[PDB]
């Protein structure tokens, strides 16, 4: 059904590549989940996350458009976004102020609500599932991936596992509490803080103090940084990380809230060169916590080429090597005799009264001295053609070349002078003879010899 | 005093480069030991190092040139020798037999005895300091770095420490028994087994119970692989590997053993391919240990493989139009300008009658249709020379050319036409013309445009 090419990302248990639909001519990503390599319940929960997938039709979305099972795997195929990450597209950008950041985070919100009304909570919110739609110029944002997400029945609370990202676990997760909506929220929190000074609010190298550093909400706003932040924006990052997750912010009302409704008079619009330059080491020390899976079994995409032009083939190598050196400076010339062929040939054509092949021969612009002329200089053939048409179209005659000398310059030109000597019968013969110096300049042009000029004397 | 090239090999305190001695031009193996990173007490023994290596002169041992100290190493200057190791060139080999190893195992001999000789003990005997004189056929294995080696007082034994690599470590110096000579023939036995069947007599993952086996003297000779070798090889192991160094043969003993002075007639001559294929992955296993700690001025990429693909520009450039307002618009290569320029210098040239000038501008071998020539065709300039000389060598005489055309036919041939038309005088003018019809054909030579043929009429 479809056409598997370049990978553009991965996780631990799942590789996303571009792919085509064969039928259908359209491109799209396809998630692969090995499913061997999963516990029976999360190969068993793929169902789920099929399902709230299909559910969510949303402009800051990415959808399933299809979902196959094979022996080892599992292929969730969604539309292809092309942007990449908003966090690497943020560092690469000329300038980059609060305005912009509540903009992503307006992009994000509005995601988050649809979730939320169709009764989904994501779990995993992180920079991760941040996408941009396309390469072009304020391309949207677009949520990513829902493998951890979980169905909610209004606005129950209930315990659905211990499931998240460290950074971003909201408190009440970390407290074994039944939970729902809310643990987003906190996750928004921590990508808004993120977005703004470019490092998270939690950070600890001990696992166990990190999560008692989010328990607590133990998080601050240090100067330098954060002396040119508005304190709209500190007051929206404080409402979403809230301890209480019946007292935090929700997507709705964030989304009211003045630094993003009420960005244009709110939102500072000064570049923050700091938050770029931290974005990036935040951005590649996510890059190097990983893993990578043991083998790469492949299909193969289609290959070779059609040759483009006409290339001479050439003398053919007359073996691998030798003990004599190759391209000895003295040897016998084929390409002379190439030009004798083609000379002949010329001849015979004029003999014959065959215009046809006379004009292969020669070049349009075919230049020409001859008494014929009368001292003129005559270009293209119509000059010849009344010879052809005329006298050409019948008595024995015999041609005779004499002396030919060949001047070989290059492998596209040449030049061949000889003495031409007819004997022929005038009236009624009476045999005659005539004699004629002639000189051909031969060309090649496009894989053909072709006279581009020719000059004769004394007939 | 030398400059140093490529690296040739490596170990945890020192690296061996090619160097080139300045004033002398001659090349020497530069071990250069970063001086940093060693001991007071390892530091301070380089002084015997360098004692060792000087007193030694021996066809199977490389000797020490020079010794230098800087501020943070030490340069010991030896003999270059650039067959690499014994070990790698034995698995390239199209042949190998015990009447081979017995050949190897000689040399290695007679260099140990005359160490011994000299009152010096190599301590650190293995196979990476078994390296060829050369890539020639049949050169000679010697014995390179002493950077463990002793100085024993006659026959008297000493604690000299513990020292050495763990599988070639003899039992007493396990044991902390006071030690000389004898340790360099225990090793001697270990590589002498490696060299038969290509794998070590003692090996153990837990370098505890790898002691243990030393100490215990307990290797075998298991079938198949030593069925095939004779008696006497493994007689002359056993002689080696005995637990009681005061039992051990020495040297000058082993060399003596009928196995090594005997070799005609006592060691087989049968090829040991399976002793080939363990010796590549010893020798694999030998250079991929992980080592404790890394320490480097760059990270270090190696350089290798082949250098495909890359395929050549086409090169073609557009030329700019000039941007003062042209009241034609017109743009012929500057190509056809240059074949006017040398047609102008010619037609001065042989208007001067300069002949000299007229020369560079024609081939030797030019060919000629001219009037003067009575409708024959003739090469060189000797024919034109007699009009150089005679005519040309003078009343007022004017040319002009009328209906110039010129035939690119590529980078390095070119063809020009034209009228030519001369108004002079005779004997008394009355002022004269006369008309010609002129061929020229150019071709670039080296750098420079030639005529190898030409053509005039009615002249």
Request: aromatic share 8%.
């Given at each position: ?88 597209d ?34 995993d ?11 072009l ?14 169905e ?12 998240g ?30 977005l ?37 924006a500190?007051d ?5 990380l ?16 003045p ?15 700091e ?29 070779g ?46 003999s ?8 292969k ?33 019948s ?8 002396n ?7 492998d ?42 020719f ?5």
């Open positions: 059904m479809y056409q598997l090419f370049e990978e553009l990302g991965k996780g631990a248990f799942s590789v996303v590549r571009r792919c085509v639909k064969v039928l259908a001519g359209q491109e799209y990503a396809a998630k692969i989940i090995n499913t061997k390599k999963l516990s029976a319940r999360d190969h068993q929960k793929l169902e789920r996350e099929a399902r709230i997938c299909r559910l969510l039709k949303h402009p800051n979305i990415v959808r399933l458009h299809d979902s196959i099972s094979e022996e080892g795997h599992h292929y969730l195929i969604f539309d292809l976004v092309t942007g990449g990450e908003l966090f690497e943020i560092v690469a950008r000329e300038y980059y102020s609060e305005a912009d950041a509540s903009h992503c985070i307006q992009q994000i919100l509005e995601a988050v609500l649809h979730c939320h009304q169709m009764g989904v909570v994501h779990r919110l992180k920079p991760e599932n941040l996408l941009l739609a396309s390469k110029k304020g391309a949207a944002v677009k949520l990513a991936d829902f493998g951890l997400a979980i909610v029945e209004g606005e129950q609370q209930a315990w659905f596992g211990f499931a990202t460290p950074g971003y676990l909201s408190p009440e997760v970390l407290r074994k509490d039944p939970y729902g909506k809310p643990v987003d929220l906190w996750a928004c929190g921590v990508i808004l803080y993120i703004l000074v470019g490092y998270p609010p939690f950070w600890d190298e001990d696992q166990h103090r990190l999560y008692q550093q989010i328990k607590a909400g133990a998080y601050d706003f240090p100067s330098p940084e954060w002396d040119t932040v508005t304190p709209e500190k929206l990052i404080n409402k979403m809230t301890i209480n997750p019946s007292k935090r912010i929700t997507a709705a009302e964030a989304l009211k809230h630094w993003i409704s009420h960005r244009s008079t709110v939102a500072s619009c000064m570049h923050r060169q938050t770029v330059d931290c974005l990036k080491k935040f951005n590649a020390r996510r890059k190097l916590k990983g893993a990578i899976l043991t083998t790469m079994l492949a299909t193969r995409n289609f290959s080429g059609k040759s483009g032009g006409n290339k001479k083939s050439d003398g053919v190598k007359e073996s691998s090597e030798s003990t004599n050196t190759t391209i000895e400076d003295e040897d016998t010339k084929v390409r002379k005799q190439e030009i004798i062929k083609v000379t002949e040939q010329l001849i015979e054509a004029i014959n009264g065959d215009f046809e092949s006379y004009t021969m020669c070049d349009p612009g075919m230049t020409a001295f001859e008494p014929e002329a009368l001292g003129n200089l005559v270009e293209g053939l119509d000059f010849h053609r009344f010879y052809f048409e005329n006298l050409w179209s008595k024995p005659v015999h041609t005779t070349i004499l030919p000398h060949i001047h070989l310059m290059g596209e030109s040449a030049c061949i002078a000889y003495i031409r000597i007819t004997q022929y019968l005038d009236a009624g013969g009476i045999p005659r003879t005539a004699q004629s110096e002639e000189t051909r300049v031969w060309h090649r042009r496009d894989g053909k010899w072709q006279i581009v000029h000059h004769r004397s004394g007939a």
